[PDB]
Design a protein around this ligand. Structure first.
Ligand SMILES: Cc1nc(C(=O)O)cc2c1[nH]c1ccccc12
Ligand SMILES: Cc1nc(C(=O)O)cc2c1[nH]c1ccccc12
Ligand SMILES: Cc1nc(C(=O)O)cc2c1[nH]c1ccccc12
Ligand SMILES: Cc1nc(C(=O)O)cc2c1[nH]c1ccccc12
Ligand SMILES: Cc1nc(C(=O)O)cc2c1[nH]c1ccccc12
Ligand SMILES: *[C@@H]1O[C@H](CO)[C@@H](O)[C@H](O)[C@H]1NC(C)=O
Ligand SMILES: *[C@@H]1O[C@H](CO)[C@@H](O)[C@H](O)[C@H]1NC(C)=O
Ligand SMILES: *[C@@H]1O[C@H](CO)[C@@H](O)[C@H](O)[C@H]1NC(C)=O
Ligand SMILES: *[C@@H]1O[C@H](CO)[C@@H](O)[C@H](O)[C@H]1NC(C)=O
Ligand SMILES: *[C@@H]1O[C@H](CO)[C@@H](O)[C@H](O)[C@H]1NC(C)=O
Ligand SMILES: *[C@@H]1O[C@H](CO)[C@@H](O)[C@H](O)[C@H]1NC(C)=O
Ligand SMILES: *[C@@H]1O[C@H](CO)[C@@H](O)[C@H](O)[C@H]1NC(C)=O
Ligand SMILES: *[C@@H]1O[C@H](CO)[C@@H](O)[C@H](O)[C@H]1NC(C)=O
Ligand SMILES: *[C@@H]1O[C@H](CO)[C@@H](O)[C@H](O)[C@H]1NC(C)=O
Ligand SMILES: *[C@@H]1O[C@H](CO)[C@@H](O)[C@H](O)[C@H]1NC(C)=O
Ligand SMILES: *[C@@H]1O[C@H](CO)[C@@H](O)[C@H](O)[C@H]1NC(C)=O
Ligand SMILES: *[C@@H]1O[C@H](CO)[C@@H](O)[C@H](O)[C@H]1NC(C)=O
Ligand SMILES: *[C@@H]1O[C@H](CO)[C@@H](O)[C@H](O)[C@H]1NC(C)=O
Ligand SMILES: *[C@@H]1O[C@H](CO)[C@@H](O)[C@H](O)[C@H]1NC(C)=O
Ligand SMILES: *[C@@H]1O[C@H](CO)[C@@H](O)[C@H](O)[C@H]1NC(C)=O
Ligand SMILES: *[C@@H]1O[C@H](CO)[C@@H](O)[C@H](O)[C@H]1NC(C)=O
Ligand SMILES: *[C@@H]1O[C@H](CO)[C@@H](O)[C@H](O)[C@H]1NC(C)=O
Ligand SMILES: *[C@@H]1O[C@H](CO)[C@@H](O)[C@H](O)[C@H]1NC(C)=O
Ligand SMILES: *[C@@H]1O[C@H](CO)[C@@H](O)[C@H](O)[C@H]1NC(C)=O
Ligand SMILES: *[C@@H]1O[C@H](CO)[C@@H](O)[C@H](O)[C@H]1NC(C)=O
Lengths: 292, 292, 292, 292, 292
């Protein structure tokens, strides 16, 4: 059976004439094809006001090294070893659309090497990835957020993102957003290789938002009532004034949750503006009637 | 008695042909069984809006090294030494459900080594661990939060979490949540080893929340009074209007503390929506009566 | 074709008598001219209250090394290599107007070296750059923010910023600000070299702000109405009082979004102050009339 | 006089056969007694809602090394040197009740060594130390916060905290809290050595809080007036309603400053709840009278 | 002309028998006099509630090394070189009144060395420096903030701050505070050397705050009017009640901007408390009149 001394001999032979910074190909004319695997773990939140979405992923990079291959029959059948991440060449795959708030660095950890040269490198990344949030159809709204991977500095003649496989790990259920992330896309080769996984997000229809809607609809009933009140009821001015105050309060409060960076404003904005305008016109008519 | 020179000789012999990155077993076919000890120290807070809980723990990892054993009779009876954490192989146990906001790194500190090979490695971890918070039964609510440990990259054929012992250190009393963390669970071996400790949290019934409830219940009395007021009292419209304004203010204010990510909304939400709806219907009836 | 051994020989010869800290010129009387390229990627936000703007850029530095040149015909036609950033002299170009909140350090990464000595060094920088925000013409306001680059410690006799080319990468569209960053400016040589790229920002006229304006203009109609109400209408005091309350609420709420550090306050401030003063004078006149 | 060469010889001889990780005693049966000095510099704030207190301290550790002693007459009377902190054994004294938000690490700096072996090690620590805040007697409230020091991993048979001397440096005056930190406590030896300094904090009676109280007491006068108003005054219902609204606003606003984690709620909570209940009963009586 | 090889020889000779941690004097009885230069660049903000002020400075330290001097005629007239900051002895000047939130460390960068031994070391420091803010005369208020420099661990017999020259770089204009920082102060030698630069700050009288004042003064007019209203006007109670509500709202809102840690509260606090008390007494008198 393989032993500690056997693995020591193997590592000593492997790292003898190895340069960490030279691209690992016998012929430098060859490109290194990297295939990436992005497995969303938990969508923490979807921040509207900052136009960010916070999630945690499991990024796996796979490629092939031609200087790190051996015959297992010469080392008592050792078929894989674990090397420190900072001793070996590693593709410079950067998340160039996200703010990487992970608690580990990209040069600490380990990677698994196989006797054929294939390297597996897995990591945890917590990302704050920028999204252009369209709040038009609030609260029945849908969004599309793209997470980008891109080679840092190497041209497509040196390092390439062969493929990107994105899936959902289903580790936890959300109860707030319907997530749909699943597919397999080839990399795009225009000067520097890159790719992106699209995340589609539909807000789930919990009854809490329906309960929040209830006051609005009854306010619709109340405003129509006061605007179709008799001209000489004897409480039109005060009633319309208080209704206008409450409407202004609602119009102010909705803004603090809704985003200001959208292709279109929300129909709810435009509808509450119409309702406030109707309340104001009702108050003006009441004042005119009292004058007359 | 053992001396400084004796310990120098011991360390020099121990670290002679030692490789930090090779798994510490004479026969590489053997697995290293790690037993973990998680001792909650102080539950700082339970953040509802972010669905996180902040606490401080004392994580202890214990395993056995077969290359670091000696006969104490040959070194004047030295039975244990202290080694820097970054000179020895260390299991890659990651907290893969938590945001590790500790102020130390996982490669600075020390570990105790015994002449039989057993290594003790203890550390402080401040964790922001994700929890799915069910606010259904607020303020008589209970929650269950699971803290996960999982081997980083090694398969169950290489590194395993043998066992997880979780307890409560009772270092401080909370006065806000009844904490119940105590047990002993075997590790789960499905590809990569992992385990989790369940924390059950029940909000304590301090009289401060009762005092907060008082205004609500008396408001129930006041709304029933106004809704069962005589049709021609002469203050129904104004009274009901002001009650509705206060009701809307309460319904808005409760939202800012309660969470939006729940299996069900809180009964308090649904009940205050019913109360506000009754107030609105009372105002409509008052308007109809004034019309008639 | 060039091979791994050829590149090993090349690097070994290049780095033989190289000093990382000596300025890379054969004759020390010569200056090193650095040309910088700043390519704005995405304008995240424009923070009014903190007088900052958050954006992400792509900073590229180009210069020439005279100790790192070779004849490609002697190494099987190798024409470029990749070196670790911390092995070679690198100009100390600091962003001396910004808070660099990037997640990487200025000594980790790679740089491309060409057989003629020309070095390309590209990086991602997330900057919080200070801007003096003039909110005079809100919400039809325009701003100018200058991003500075400056050599750290070397005098213009040693290191110089030859030129600065700034452009907009058009990676995403904003929908909130009209960005206009494009040009080419020589460096300024007054003791220590520096340069700056001007960003002009005009807030876009989305209909959401128009919807926000609607309540204000109708409030203008309502205040003029109440101030030109008949002296003995019988609701002047109460109506004017409520209008004044709403006016004070709006005047308070506008402050929390607008900045306090401006050459002039916003015309909207001065106009809402005039409107509130008119409402107060109307209330005083109503009180005087009721007295009479 | 002593010279640079003399100090070079001294350091070279001292560090020859020195091991950074071996506990610095000739006989390993001996314990190393550490005496700590904690000198509070400025109490920044006392955060009620997070149950933390932020302050800056000056932590000094003193112990004795038996491998770092020399005869000063053999080095031209050199009596003390300065060594880098990371070349020498240093006790692992951790602040195990606090979140260490300092801007330096525990392995960068310097320490003073004396020819007798005595080592002085001084540092700046900014600490966010957890406190259980009893807001019962607000705003005449007193608090007790304990700052803990504890050996990290060594047992009382290896490393001990001999003594802890805590004082107040009086560097600045607070004007918000009366601080009383002064004493001298032996270390506690139960498995692992530790100790704690008690900080007693009494909120100072500035007239600003009295000014804040004034509206409350006059509101007491107003509520008693309305509750002892004649049954048929003709404004009882409206007056009581407005008083109830303002009281509810105060009861809501007080919560946002007061803490939710206390042994008892504040008497101010319970008293304002009594006042709100009395206002509600007054309004109910008014409604009953209007019915009759 | 001097060449790369000449500078290589120079550095090799300079660093031959150099110890980074030995104080750089031939005779150890001599003190090293450090002169510091602090050049404020931009005052970002003056945080009232946290009692901090955020600014960016340019700290320059100058001292003399006696082991790093050469004759330029022996190296082809080389007169200055650039060394890495972490290879040479550096005075441990700490900002011991501030929270150093800079993005660089105190051991990365470069320093210029001259053939006479004089070393220049310049750096960027972003500081959050504690200030005791006296808000007595708000908004015509003045403040004094002292920024401290102090040697870390060396006594005045080893390292001294000879002098401190503080100036204002006038890089940007503020428009919010009148800054006056300029002078030259000797260091204070009481055990450990230190010094401080006083910053005087007077809030500028922009017309925005005048506009903010306008509502207050007109409210003074309105409260005097209602308090000197006829006893039987027929709107005294309701008018005084609404005025009192608005007064309470303003008294609450002013607190959130003003500080709680002051020698005296602001005259604006005391004056608005007087105004609120007068409004309350007016309401009480109105109630008494209605009773009579
Ligand atoms: C489906 C899946 N999920 C996760 C997760 O962290 O959720 C992690 C892995 C994974 N497949 C792997 C294959 C090799 C290494 C790690 C993983
Ligand atoms: C019950 C307990 N509690 C704590 C705590 O920090 O609260 C720490 C330890 C502990 N047992 C240990 C055994 C070995 C090393 C450290 C600890
Ligand atoms: C137009 C442009 N944009 C970006 C971007 O990140 O948006 C990056 C680059 C770029 N040109 C380059 C030339 C060499 C290396 C990198 C880049
Ligand atoms: C009373 C006192 N105060 C402070 C402070 O930073 O406030 C610092 C020290 C000190 N005594 C010392 C003795 C040796 C080294 C440093 C200090
Ligand atoms: C007046 C002034 N201002 C600044 C600033 O960054 O504002 C920087 C410097 C300076 N003088 C120097 C002399 C040597 C090195 C740097 C500086
Ligand atoms: C490298 O190229 C040579 C000739 O071009 C070829 O014979 C050899 O097989 C190549 N090596 C690899 C690993 O492709
Ligand atoms: C080598 O190991 C593989 C996998 O464990 C096994 O299938 C094979 O039979 C082994 N061969 C020898 C010669 O031991
Ligand atoms: C996810 O989105 C894709 C494309 O928008 C669609 O084809 C697929 O059906 C979606 N998933 C589900 C479960 O509907
Ligand atoms: C991706 O590249 C492979 C390589 O030939 C090609 O067969 C395939 O059609 C491409 N597209 C997709 C979607 O896989
Ligand atoms: C390793 O394996 C050999 C044979 O398989 C056995 O004799 C030996 O005892 C094993 N060593 C250990 C430490 O289990
Ligand atoms: C070795 O040490 C242990 C524990 O201190 C003790 O029980 C034993 O008697 C010692 N043996 C010798 C030979 O000193
Ligand atoms: C803690 O929870 C477990 C399982 O939910 C239960 O068996 C145990 O009784 C609980 N602890 C206490 C003190 O009740
Ligand atoms: C855990 O594993 C041990 C190992 O045999 C087994 O005896 C035990 O039943 C398992 N379960 C628990 C709860 O300990
Ligand atoms: C350096 O200077 C010498 C004489 O001044 C000149 O001959 C030589 O070409 C110069 N080298 C470079 C690289 O400019
Ligand atoms: C060297 O490489 C360049 C670019 O690949 C090519 O144009 C040239 O013909 C090559 N020369 C030789 C001798 O291989
Ligand atoms: C950008 O600004 C410059 C100078 O202010 C101006 O010349 C140019 O026309 C602007 N860009 C566009 C697209 O108008
Ligand atoms: C910049 O410097 C070059 C160098 O000669 C000069 O030709 C040019 O006029 C300068 N100005 C601009 C705007 O390029
Ligand atoms: C160490 O122990 C021996 C005998 O036990 C004793 O003679 C010697 O003085 C001790 N050394 C110290 C430094 O205490
Ligand atoms: C050694 O130094 C001390 C303190 O400076 C002094 O008191 C003593 O006289 C000196 N002795 C000699 C021999 O220089
Ligand atoms: C500080 O507290 C201790 C114990 O609580 C007390 O003895 C001492 O008198 C207090 N300090 C002052 C100045 O009163
Ligand atoms: C602390 O320990 C010393 C050591 O003997 C002892 O004399 C003293 O009584 C103890 N208690 C205090 C408060 O110092
Ligand atoms: C050091 O001291 C000696 C005698 O005390 C003196 O001759 C020499 O000049 C001094 N060196 C320096 C650099 O002051
Ligand atoms: C040395 O350089 C200085 C400054 O460049 C110059 O004034 C002096 O003439 C030069 N001397 C020689 C001998 O080159
Ligand atoms: C700055 O303050 C000092 C002392 O307070 C004063 O002498 C000086 O005149 C002030 N500066 C100006 C420009 O008035
Ligand atoms: C500072 O020290 C020098 C040194 O002699 C002295 O001349 C001067 O008077 C001192 N005071 C000031 C303000 O410079």
């Amino acid at each position: 059976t393989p032993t500690y001394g056997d693995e020591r001999l193997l590592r000593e032979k492997l790292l003898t004439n190895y340069s960490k910074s030279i691209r690992p190909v016998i012929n430098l004319t060859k490109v290194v094809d990297v295939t990436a695997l992005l497995y969303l773990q938990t969508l923490y939140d979807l921040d509207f006001v900052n136009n960010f979405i916070m999630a945690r992923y499991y990024l796996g990079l796979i490629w092939i090294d031609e200087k790190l291959t051996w015959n297992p029959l010469d080392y008592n059948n050792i078929t894989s070893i674990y090397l420190p991440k900072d001793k070996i060449w590693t593709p410079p795959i950067k998340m160039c659309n996200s703010m990487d708030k992970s608690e580990e660095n990209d040069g600490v950890g380990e990677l698994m090497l196989t006797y054929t040269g294939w390297i597996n490198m897995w990591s945890f990344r917590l990302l704050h990835t920028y999204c252009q949030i369209n709040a038009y159809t609030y609260p029945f709204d849908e969004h599309t957020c793209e997470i980008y991977l891109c080679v840092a500095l190497h041209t497509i003649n040196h390092t390439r993102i062969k493929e990107l496989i994105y899936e959902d790990s289903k580790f936890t259920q959300n109860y707030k957003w319907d997530i749909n992330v699943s597919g397999k896309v080839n990399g795009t080769d225009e000067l520097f290789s890159y790719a992106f996984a699209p995340m589609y997000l539909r807000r789930k229809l919990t009854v809490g938002i329906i309960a929040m809607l209830i006051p609005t609809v009854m306010m619709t009933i109340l405003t129509i009532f006061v605007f179709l009140l008799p001209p000489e009821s004897g409480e039109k001015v005060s009633l319309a004034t208080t209704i206008f105050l409450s409407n202004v309060l609602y119009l102010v409060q909705i803004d603090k949750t809704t985003p200001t960076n959208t292709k279109y404003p929300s129909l709810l904005m435009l509808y509450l503006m119409l309702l406030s305008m109707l309340s104001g016109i009702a108050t003006l008519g009441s004042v005119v009637i009292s004058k007359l």
